[PDB]
Amino acid sequence: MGSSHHHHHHSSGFIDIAAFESPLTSSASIQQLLEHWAADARKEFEKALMAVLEKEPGKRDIINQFQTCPPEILNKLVLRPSVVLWTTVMLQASNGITIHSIDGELIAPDINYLEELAESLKSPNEGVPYINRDDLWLRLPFGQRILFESDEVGNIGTTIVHESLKLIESWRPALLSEIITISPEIQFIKDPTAHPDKVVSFSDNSVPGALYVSIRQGSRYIDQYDLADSLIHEHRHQKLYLLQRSIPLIEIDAPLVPSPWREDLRPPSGLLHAIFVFTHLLEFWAYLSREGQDQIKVRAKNQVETIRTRLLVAIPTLKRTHLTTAGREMVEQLEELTTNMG
Template sequence: MKQDPIFSSFLIKVASRCNLNCAYCYMYQHADQSWKDKPLVLSEKHQQLFVDRLYDYAQEKSLDKVLVIYHGGEPLIFGADKLVNFSKAIKKRLDTISCQVDFGIQTNGTLLKEEHLKLFVDENISVSLSIDGPKKIHNVYRLDHKGNPSFDKVYRALALLKKYPQIFSGCIAVINVNYSPRELFQFFSENEVEEFNILLPDANYTSPPIGRDQNPDVYIDWLIEAFDCWSAEFPHIQCKFFESIILALLGKSGQTDALGLGDVSLLNIETDGMYHDLDVLKITKEGYSSLGIGLETAPISAAAQSKNIEVHRKLLSKEGLSKTCLACKHVDICGGGSVPHRFGTEGFDNPTIYCKEMYALIDHISEKLIQLVDQELEKNESSSILFSQKEMEDFCIYSNSEKQIRKLQEYVAQKKRAQWERIAVEAKQRFPSQEALINQTNNQVSSVGERALMHPVSSSFLDALEQSLKGKVVEGMDGTPLPIDIDFLHLIGTKLLRKEEFVIQENHDWYTHALGKDIVFNHPQTAFDLGKKVIEDALGMIQEYDTHLYDEMKIISPYIYIVKDKNSPPDRDISFADETLPGAIFIGVWKGNRCLAPYKVAASMIHEHCHQKLYLLQERFEIIEPQDVEIYSPWPEKYRPPIAALHAVYVFIHVAKFLNHVAICDQNLQEEIDLTLERIDGCISEIQEKVQFTPMGALFFESLLKEWELLKSQSLCLT
């Protein structure tokens, strides 16, 4: 059985009248005219009843924090001193159960005085101001009952509020599509307003948006222009409307009623003490927001159980959306739009009356986000991520490489985060029944950061999932289609979290799929124990050889897997790494039925680590210019693409350095070292003759040649 909603916000109509007569007002200019029969202000009796009811409800639900918003009409008609006394009474009572109360007031500002603000500061009552922008825009609709403009009085209130920033919570503005959005943003920027929200004029299918009949695209054009203007010129101003859409696109919850999914969390109390649902529902029909009970007859928990609230909750879920909305690609972002804006003669079974506007705007913002990510990556490429010659030389060796490695990993982390955000949006559309799982994964990623996305398995799975969402068949290394199971996401950030310490043989079925059925991971316990001991001994040798290399491997290649290849000849030892599994190296420790010597296993681990290190560099930079050329590689004794030959030179230089170090342990290594040096020399000559590098690739190859010259000069075995 679905639990009752929890009210955490309480909108108190302390006054039922207003000294302004704004043309678009949902309270006075739409279907529900019941305000005419309401008391002018909330009585002392109902004030005390609210204090008692709120105390009981907070205690019943174990609430530790609530928000009380004073509203109207114009709440200052009630009196600033009365608002303060009311707030003191609420706070005093709820303090006894350690429930914090935040207070706010939404005002048109015309009655606001500095003495009021001093009182509000003492009680920490925040103030939000309704102002539609500069004078010529504001005075179009915000007039008093005699038709007089209100801007001058409201602007004086804005000037006062700027003197009390500790309680000034920003502005709200109803948009007027007949004026440029830039004028609106410029006004708030010049007046140092740090936060404001834009509101679409309240409308529905019985009362369509102002002016759209003459220009069907006028709201689309205005909103897109406004977003572009805000994001390019005024991002220093918080605009909840746009920020909420961005958050929704990133899989997070926003703070605007323009987006429809969520739950009921606000209870409205009118001046007669009656409980009401969301007050903007007054634009639908007479009395629709009323719950039929009030402070005098029922506790707040009874309001949460009312039929009207149940209907509203359904409308805030996918179950309550129209077929049009459910078929829309933006359903998880828009959520059907504002509930009052869906109303028509047959009820709420419609998308928002601003459907085409929201669709076009979300499309536009989504595209802009992708462009911004690309621009940020390009910006990084031209700034701090670029390596100087000295930095590239440091990268090629172990002792000074960590700074450069961290730079590269930070870049990869940004790419992975952007990839996950794309996947989350697309996956919600493709797998609507898994929305909770996707949100849970997003929360986990937000909690632990990019480490959740950079585990070898997470990275590989997300690459495959993204391709699958594009309709592509994704295959493992043996050509077998990979199983793409969305349930896999629950492991990301929980069981799959990248570490910077050696992890030997972390079991996961994904490796079997990705690498193919011929690669064996499961070994008899005795054989595995022997293999693990060899790996540990090999790591000890690497640490003794070069602690910087050992530490670097923990950062780049911490995941070590003991494997066999069913198709490999018994007398051949195998090892490999793959760029689709960043951070993992796969090592064979047996030759036939006997374990390899630890130094041989250590050489294989260094070899595969160097591949992973170069893959990391390739994630950020193109190394070789596109060209139709192949290089003879003497190790497999065949022609290969230039990048493969470059990999071979890089890894074997470092393997040869290590073998020189351990040659004293095995005099038979001299022949192997000599052959390796001869092959490196021949492959380098081929590369120098045939390969055209990018600027960063040229830096890398130049640094590599310095390593090569150093190796030749230090080699014990070079003839």
């Protein structure tokens, strides 16, 4: 009924991947991928700064703040989710290309964002992962379809996030460090169309580095384990976005493959993102089923059985797809982790 049948793909005729997977051995690989991405993003940001000066030459004094800015600060600034979206929308607007939010609304290029962006350089040291910061260029890709929690709602959510991050740190301190480097922004969302008891968490690569997690289950708040699951789930997408940017994993994103997590046929890259996400959540709930409290051991044992079953069905499905050399190396490493935990 829904369908995706017009695919133009009816033409079917340099880093350690294994070390990148585990947070213990990924530190160097991530730094290497971030340096390559920041090299392209600095040029893109400079191109956007020149486009701002063409429309409004009066913005020259605002642009001057970045000119003398140290490259160490500038390299971290151009990779922020809100900055990447602003730079992308800005460059596409100059090429006559429109960018829209999920609700079909046009994301207008705002020159006045540079003034807010320049004033951020006057206080560089802030919280390691930015918990529910008020930034329109983080809310823009969703428009009105997704609501952003604020005030008392955000105040309570910050404390639950702190306990989820402390829980993640107790399991793997290397994964918390990985979260600070790849996913530095945590936004609190609420899906009005979703069922109150459903935990909603999503990620978009138009804003890379921002994790959108729901803290409210109706009027009630979710717990530190479910919120840590949501944070790890979206962090794994952000981590794979970084790898895909430089080292492609899928040679041909067709034909569509079935996923144990979706009813419809999803592309091979989507199933790779799903296995990459759920491999880390299988390891998280495996730790909670052994070294966790007696109250969590019931839910954790259910999650291990549910996730391992789905992973053991998705991995063979993905193996018979157009995977690159790096993509196949990733699948074989994720399969090894699922097998060594049965």
